[PDB]
Amino acid sequence: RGKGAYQDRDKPAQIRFSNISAAKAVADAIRTSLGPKGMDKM
Amino acid sequence: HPTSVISGYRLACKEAVRYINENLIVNTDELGRDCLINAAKTSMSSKIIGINGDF
Amino acid sequence: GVFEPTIVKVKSLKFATEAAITILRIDDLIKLHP
Ligand SMILES: Nc1ncnc2c1ncn2[C@@H]1O[C@H](COP(=O)(O)OP(=O)(O)O)[C@@H](O)[C@H]1O
Numbered sequence: 001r002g003k004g005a006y007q008d009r010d011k012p013a014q015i016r017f018s019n020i021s022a023a024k025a026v027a028d029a030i031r032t033s034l035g036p037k038g039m040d041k042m
Numbered sequence: 043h044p045t046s047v048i049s050g051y052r053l054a055c056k057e058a059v060r061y062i063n064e065n066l067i068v069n070t071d072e073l074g075r076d077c078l079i080n081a082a083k084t085s086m087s088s089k090i091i092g093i094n095g096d097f
Numbered sequence: 098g099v100f101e102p103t104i105v106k107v108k109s110l111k112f113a114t115e116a117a118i119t120i121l122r123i124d125d126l127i128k129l130h131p
Pocket residue numbers: 033034035036038
């Protein structure tokens with residue numbers, strides 16, 4: 001068409017990225033406890 | 043890796059227990075009652091009843 | 098006449114090894130605010 005349906009808010013995208021970041025952080029946190037060579041957390 | 047250190051420690055514990063039980067033990071039957079007195083004195087050495095352990 | 102019961106040394110080794118393994122397995126620590 002041309003221009004396209006313009007997004008006004010950008011807060012939804014911020015929420016998506018914040019949620020993705022938090023989830024990846026939790027994973028990265030418990031990523032070294034995986035497998036036989038994985039270690040414990042206190 | 044800590045797993046490898048742990049495996050080695052476990053093995054060394056097992057083999058140290060076995061080596062003690064097979065080579066480093068003395069039967070108190072061969073020694074009689076003075077063995078008991080000596081074991082008690084050994085435990086009491088380092089305590090405030092050390093030199094009096096004899097009694 | 099310096100004798101110790103075998104159980105003393107044996108249990109010392111077993112318990113020390115288990116404690117060392119337990120502490121040596123920790124690679125992270127999360128201390129939560131009370
Ligand atoms: N002896 C082993 N050698 C190689 N991979 C292993 C061994 N034991 C477990 N795994 C792998 O390690 C992965 C994680 O297992 P684990 O640490 O218990 O975490 P989870 O409980 O999430 O499965 C499993 O997907 C398994 O495929």
